[PDB]
């Protein structure tokens, strides 16, 4: 098994789907390429995703003593976390529900020999 390091960004104030939109971009790529794509991705969800990927890389470097250049985004996924319920008033005094969703973005970077 490849030496892996984990990083979970929990309760991120972004939808699980909107985090997944960029996690799909940077799943499978090396850590460096993933961070570059998340740097130049126009989606705002790329910033928490980039931060959690970089945290996984930092854990691999410091807590695990792995070579940062050999790291790769092995398994990354955003699960949906808690959802706050808000009320938006609409016409005729009718209250519609608004969902302030969060996401847990889990990242596991492995150190693979190219």
């Amino acid at each position: 098994e490849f030496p892996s390091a984990t990083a979970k960004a929990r309760y991120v104030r972004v939808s699980a789907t909107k985090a997944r939109r960029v996690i799909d971009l940077v799943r499978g790529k090396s850590v460096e390429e993933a961070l570059d794509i998340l740097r130049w991705a126009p989606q705002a969800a790329s910033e928490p995703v980039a931060k959690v990927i970089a945290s996984a890389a930092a854990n691999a470097q410091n807590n695990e003593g792995l070579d940062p250049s050999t790291l790769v985004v092995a398994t990354v996924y955003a699960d949906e976390g808690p959802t706050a319920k808000r009320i938006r008033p609409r016409a005729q005094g009718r209250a519609f529900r608004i969902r302030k969703r969060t996401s847990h973005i889990t990242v596991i970077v492995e150190s693979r020999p190219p």
């Binding site: 939109r21 799909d24 971009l25 570059d36 130049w40």
Partner: protein
């Protein structure tokens, strides 16, 4: 109008998969002796120092 049936999982996901981001095409730029990746669109700006590469 209003949706008459609940959409099946297969259809919902088939048509939801189309809401995907397109990864930017990154080219190499040498700035401050370092090789960074920037869009070819921002290649000139990065060379001239008009891109914040952090």
């Amino acid at each position: 109008a209003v949706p008459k049936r609940r959409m099946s999982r297969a259809n919902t996901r088939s048509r939801r998969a189309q809401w995907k981001a397109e990864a930017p095409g990154l080219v190499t730029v040498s700035v401050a002796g370092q090789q960074r990746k920037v869009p070819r669109r921002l290649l000139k700006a990065a060379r001239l120092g008009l891109v914040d590469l952090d």
